[PDB]
Amino acid sequence: GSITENTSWNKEFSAEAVNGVFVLCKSSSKSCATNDLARASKEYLPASTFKIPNAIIGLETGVIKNEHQVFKWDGKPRAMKQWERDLTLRGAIQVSAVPVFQQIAREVGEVRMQKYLKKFSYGNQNISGGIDKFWLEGQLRISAVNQVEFLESLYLNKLSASKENQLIVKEALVTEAAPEYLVHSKTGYSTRIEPKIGWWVGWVEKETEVYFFAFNMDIDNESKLPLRKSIPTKIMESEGIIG
Amino acid sequence: GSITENTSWNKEFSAEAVNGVFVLCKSSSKSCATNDLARASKEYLPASTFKIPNAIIGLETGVIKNEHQVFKWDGKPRAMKQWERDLTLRGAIQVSAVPVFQQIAREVGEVRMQKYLKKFSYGNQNISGGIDKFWLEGQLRISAVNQVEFLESLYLNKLSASKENQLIVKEALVTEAAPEYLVHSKTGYSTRIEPKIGWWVGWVEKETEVYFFAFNMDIDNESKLPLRKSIPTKIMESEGII
């Protein structure tokens, strides 16, 4: 496919004084557009966007039994009150329950985790830093371009995993349903390297078109987090894709 | 299973002067709650709620190739403008594109259609009335209780169909997503045989629980149609489900 730099979205970044990048790819034309070709190829910690490949690997290895698996809370204190409950796979992904996925990673183990990230061509494929924290504070890095490539493979069932397991994760990622479109997406917030990085990645099925997207931005403080969704949402609204 | 009458729900019906039934089942269809025991098991034409089994059967028979199938519009008139476009499986379900599903039914054919309705224990399993219209004006009938049983089977991947195909149809049925809950659903409106019936069937996943539901009502006219969703929505909001 192709990628082209544009300027028609810059106003959305400058209006909020944000440094960031949006990559948007139309499946049928095999064409992507981005406001910043350089930043589109810059590689950052995936943070909770890593729950996508982790969920798939968890399923593929049998660590996660199926889509009806309940991840029970043991009662031990968690970093967030909202994680302190039993969760489904979709629930754990949607609330970004890190401890659930740290346990998954541990059970997958280094050898299998490495193998699957190679198969998925996932970022720099570097799982150094501890089996349960490599995507949060370790050496793993991925770009916005690589995110959209990965997500397109998931959409097409082309990852090295069963179609059934890819379908399970795809439904777990649904975040907005409308009669005219369906959005699958995942946020991330990497706080361990400076500048902190906010992600929103996913895809939109609209009419018979499919649009893959990846957004990241420097996050000055927590009050800026909603911009991870609002900036790319405005862009996609102006493109006639959603809303 | 068992079905228990809940008198309080009736309020949402009488307020609107509606004759109908809501069936709601927490966890499984072993025990369900309803406003009307008799009507819970009364059988009506499924109308476009039949697109659920029809889509599964289309996939199982290979009539629908896979989840990425595009149903091409030939450019000739269709009965609604919203149908006059290429559609995905989810698109055709969401806009209730009758002609796309009529073509699927024709290609499936009577023998295979009959076979799968028996496998799915789908209502009275009677497909008489024409291969492309039996769910619209034929002899096919299904109750709210049987809709919930069928949808529970789908939710559990227990229908006589591949897990892949059940997952494909389940994703096509998503109608509301929130971080805490997910709704899968389908509307129907039986117009050709009296009394006219409006349907809304589906399930809600909230926290670690699942709720199966089926609603139907007598429809006096077009203006009453929104009540198919609003009455059961209000009941489900009142139970803390959505």
In chain A, residues with a C-beta closer than 8 Å to the C-beta of B168 are 167
Experimentally, the structure was elucidated by X-ray
CATH 3.40.710.10 fits B1-242, yes or no: yes
C-alpha to C-alpha distance for A151 and B63, rounded to whole angstroms: 28
Rounded distance between C-alpha atoms, residue A180 and residue A175, angstroms: 14
Q: Is the peptide bond between A195 and the residue preceding it cis, with omega within 30 degrees of 0?
A: yes
Contact B74, B188 (CB under 8 A): no
Contact residues, chain B, for A70 at CB < 8 Å: 208
User: From CA A3, how far away is CA A32, in angstroms rounded?
Assistant: 4
Query: Inter-chain contact B67–A164, Cβ cutoff 8 Å?
Result: no
- Chain A CB contacts of B170 under 8 Å are 171
Q: How far apart are alpha carbons A154 and A98 in whole angstroms?
A: 22
Residue A218 carries which side chain, given as an amino acid letter? D
**CB-CB neighbors (< 8 A) of A180 in chain B:** 94
- Find, in chain A, the residue whose alpha carbon is nearest to that of B89: A208
For B88-142, the three-class secondary structure string (H helix, E strand, C coil) is CHHHHHHCCCHHHHHHHHHHHCHHHHHHHHHHCCCCCCCCCCCCCCHHHHCCCCE
C-alpha span between A231 and A109 (Å, rounded): 37
**Cβ proximity of A127 and A105 under 8 Å:** no
Residue B18 to residue B9: CA distance in whole angstroms: 12
Residue with tokens 């909001």: B237
Question: Contact at 8 Å (CB) between A226 and A234?
Answer: no
Q: Which residue has the tokens 């489904």?
A: A88
Q: Count the Cβ atoms, other than its own, within 10 Å of residue B186.
A: 24
Interatomic CA distance for residues A225 and B4, integer angstroms: 47
Header resolution in angstroms? 1.6
Nearest CA in chain A to B70: A208
Q: Are B155 and A88 in contact (CB under 8 A)?
A: no
φ and ψ of B148, to 5 deg = -65, -35
Are residues A167 and B208, on separate chains, in Cβ contact within 8 Å?
A: no
Give binding residues of A for Mg(2+) as ranges: 220
Distance CA B231, CA A149 (A): 44
Q: With left for phi above 0 and alpha for psi between -120 and 50, is residue B157 left, alpha or beta? A: left
Pick the CATH number of A1-243 from 2.40.30.10, 3.40.50.170, 2.60.120.920, 3.40.710.10: 3.40.710.10
Cross-chain residue pair A205–B163, CB shorter than 8 Å: no
Bond into B232 cis (ω within 30): no
Sign of the four-CA dihedral B158, B159, B162, B163? negative
CA atoms within 13 A on the CB side of A67: 21
- Closest CB to A170: pick one of B70, B91, B171: B171
> Which residue carries 């690997």 as its tokens?
A57
The residue in chain B having the minimum alpha-carbon distance to the alpha carbon of residue A168 is B167
Nearest-neighbour CA in chain A from B37: distance (Å): 31
Q: Smallest CA–CA separation between A180 and chain B, in Å?
A: 7
Which of B171, B180, B208 lies nearest to residue A171, judging by beta carbons? B171
The residue written with tokens 């008198």 in the block is: B7
Long-range pairs for B97-104: beta carbons < 8 A, 24 or more residues apart:
B97/B71, B98/B48, B98/B136, B100/B71, B101/B50, B101/B51, B101/B54, B101/B55, B102/B132, B102/B133, B103/B71, B103/B132, B104/B54, B104/B55, B104/B57, B104/B58, B104/B63, B104/B64
Residue A168 contacts B, CB cutoff 8 Å: yes
Query: What distance in Å separates the CA atoms of residue A231 and residue A215, rounded to the nearest whole number?
Result: 9
For B12, phi then psi, to 5°, come to -70, -25
